Design a binder for this molecule. Structure first.
Ligand SMILES: [Mg+2]
Lengths: 135, 189, 56, 64
RNA sequence: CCGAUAACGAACGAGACUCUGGCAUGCUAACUAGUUACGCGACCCCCGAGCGGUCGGCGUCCCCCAACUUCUUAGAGGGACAAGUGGCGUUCAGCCACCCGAGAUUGAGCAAUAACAGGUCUGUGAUGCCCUUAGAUGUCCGGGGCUGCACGCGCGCUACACUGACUGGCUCAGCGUGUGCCUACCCUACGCCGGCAGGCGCGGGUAACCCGUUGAACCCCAUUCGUGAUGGGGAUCGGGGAUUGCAAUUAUUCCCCAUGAACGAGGAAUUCCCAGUAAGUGCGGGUCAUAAGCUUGCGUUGAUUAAGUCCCUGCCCUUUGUACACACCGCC
């Protein structure tokens, strides 16, 4: 109990992680040996507390994308977002299941009689809506 | 092999019920040459369970203001009491102590706050650790009021308190109090 | 802390000044605030190219 | 005529009660019928896994 | 603190910080601290040991005539971070358990906004205003008083005893002080006298150099006592002897011989406290010409119970009600 870290240590940890992600590691003693030159810590207790939180956050980083910014994580995310367009589009279906009402709309729009449309059998029952109230 | 006080081997002592065998500590891992060890047994909860019960009796026997650091006096009292009970009964003093503890621990009690019927609203069975604590406290208290204002010394009073409690004879203050508590709890069921 | 002897009595003056931090120390303390953490700015050090061997 | 005393082992500790914390309520499993288990309130320090005597079998079960 | 989010970005407080305690056979260093070794001795065994045992006996920073820093000292550094493992957790913030570790919560100091008609004008040549100011409410000198007692209350000390009292022997501390501007008043070793309180000569110390290896008390080991208001308790009181002072009566204090009173564990009530803690036990400092039942610290011995709760007494946050706002000790 009573081991909750504060803004000072957390912000310092996040800043130095996003500034020196390459040099840092998962070893507490190595991470407390890099802090004396990558930062100016007025207190030894503060320094090693920050180093412990850096180790914790870097374990979390290697297991997943923590909100701390990271260049490798961002380039992987950018690759996964602005790429991987499939070699076939998802919107060029050979046939499109189309409602008779939509077919009438297309006829009025003058786009009726398209070879890629298959008119679905309309559903019967009109049984939408959730039953009202509980029970 | 350890021979508390130089005799009375601990290996032949048997705890007769499994309710308190995790809290009585006379077995060979807790067998000590002398009942005096500043082992920090109150630093954390349940640490006193692994403290030897001879040490527990020594710690409890030094009470009532005049006697709060005199642990050497208490150790010599325990040694003389064990000698006396060995002479009087012929069996292991540690066995006598264990039987006294088991027969002195009150199996249930009663505790509450509100409009109590007789003593307390509810009757409550107790934990084995509370059993051992209450038994040791009752034995030391009985020895103390036995030895207060008579020529019979504290060694003999503790000795015959343990002797009476080990059998169960209503002559020991410990089991008299235990039976009173049993009656109170039974009425407060 | 100073006293001012005015016609109506005594007026108390208390002045507290937080001195700025300076490494020189002739205007303030040399030591920084205990909770203040300063981080040096890293360089680029990219090295995106093929390995080479530079004789020197 | 009176019911004999019977032993039972604490499995899970429910929590403190009595409004002063003087009692801890636990779930306790009988020795004779391991499939039999009730809820009892006990006084004194209790940790799960230790065994204790029941002078009377069923007194009071009440979830906190 | 993580997170949500009409808020964003900050500031104080908390924390961080300083001192302290616990670990460093790792570094530096020691005749105002030592250890080890060696050499002189002193004594026992000397049957025979003999590199046998003891020495807080003497020497080896006397300057060439040993080293070393474990123990002591005090600096520089390290060391502990929920870091490692398991579980719980939104698997976040964190929590629990364990290993390794000296240590997995050592205690303090400082400590925000706003406020109280809280206390001090008897700390001040801090001070407004009023009063007095020569028959003084200034100042000095003499004496008395602040102590005075049918009674009530608070903080404490001593006890009611055998887990003890007395007598003797044995054996252990740590804080910290010590000769003065005025200002006189220091801590004391050793030797002699006295039964004691004390007195008289000779020194040492302005101090890790001397008191002092602070030979403390409790405790421990033996003796007597024997459940009685007793060898428990030492109040009250008589006689006598010293010390301080200018002066001891309304006894300053100390000492000796006498008296041995209430008190046999304490109603209703009520205080403090979680580990080297409570309590027992002494020792320093402050006050001090003389002096501690006080206080502030120090060590020694050293536990029972608990790791929870909101029952009582209170505190913090949110919702809610209000006829309160001097704020429920309100209002009516
Ligand atoms: Mg006498």
């Amino acid at each position: 109990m009573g081991r909750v870290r504060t803004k000072t240590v957390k912000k310092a940890a996040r800043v130095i992680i996003e500034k020196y992600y390459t040099r840092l590691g998962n070893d507490f003693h190595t991470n407390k040996r890099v802090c004396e030159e990558i930062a100016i810590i007025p207190s030894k207790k503060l320094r090693n507390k920050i180093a412990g939180y850096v180790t914790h956050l870097m374990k979390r980083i290697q297991r997943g994308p923590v909100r701390g910014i990271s260049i490798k994580l961002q380039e992987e995310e950018r690759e996964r977002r602005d790429n991987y367009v499939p070699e076939v589009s998802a919107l060029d279906q050979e046939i499109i299941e189309v409602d008779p009402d939509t077919k009438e709309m297309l006829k009025l729009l003058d786009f009726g009689s398209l070879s890629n449309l298959q008119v679905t059998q309309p559903t019967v029952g009109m049984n939408f809506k959730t039953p009202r109230g509980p029970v | 092999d350890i021979k508390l006080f130089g005799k009375w081997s601990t290996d032949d002592v048997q705890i007769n019920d499994i309710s308190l065998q995790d809290y009585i500590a006379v077995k060979e891992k807790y067998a000590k040459y002398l009942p005096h060890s500043a082992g920090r047994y109150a630093a954390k909860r349940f640490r006193k369970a692994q403290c030897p019960i001879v040490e527990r009796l020594t710690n409890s026997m030094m009470m009532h203001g005049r006697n709060n650091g005199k642990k050497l006096m208490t150790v010599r009292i325990v040694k003389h009491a064990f000698e006396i009970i060995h002479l009087l009964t012929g069996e292991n003093p540690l066995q006598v102590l264990v039987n006294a503890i088991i027969n002195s621990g009150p199996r249930e009690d009663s505790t509450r706050i509100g409009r109590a019927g007789t003593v307390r609203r509810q009757a409550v069975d107790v934990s084995p650790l509370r059993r051992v604590n209450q038994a040791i406290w009752l034995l030391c208290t009985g020895a103390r009021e036995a030895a207060f204002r008579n020529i019979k010394t504290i060694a003999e009073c503790l000795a015959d308190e343990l002797i009476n409690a080990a059998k169960g004879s209503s002559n020991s203050y410990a089991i008299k109090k235990k039976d009173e508590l049993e009656r109170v709890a039974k009425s407060n069921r | 802390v100073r006293h001012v002897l005015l016609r109506q009595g005594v007026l108390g003056i208390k002045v507290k000044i937080m001195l700025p931090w300076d490494p020189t120390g002739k205007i303030g303390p040399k030591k920084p605030l205990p909770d203040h953490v300063s981080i040096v700015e890293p360089k680029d050090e990219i090295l995106p190219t093929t390995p080479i061997s530079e004789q020197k | 005529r009176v019911q004999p005393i019977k032993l039972a082992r604490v499995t899970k500790v429910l929590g403190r009660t009595g409004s002063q914390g003087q009692c801890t309520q636990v779930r306790v499993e009988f020795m004779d019928d391991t499939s039999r288990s009730i809820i009892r309130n006990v006084k004194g320090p209790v940790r799960e896994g230790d065994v204790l005597t029941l002078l009377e079998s069923e007194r009071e079960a009440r979830r906190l």
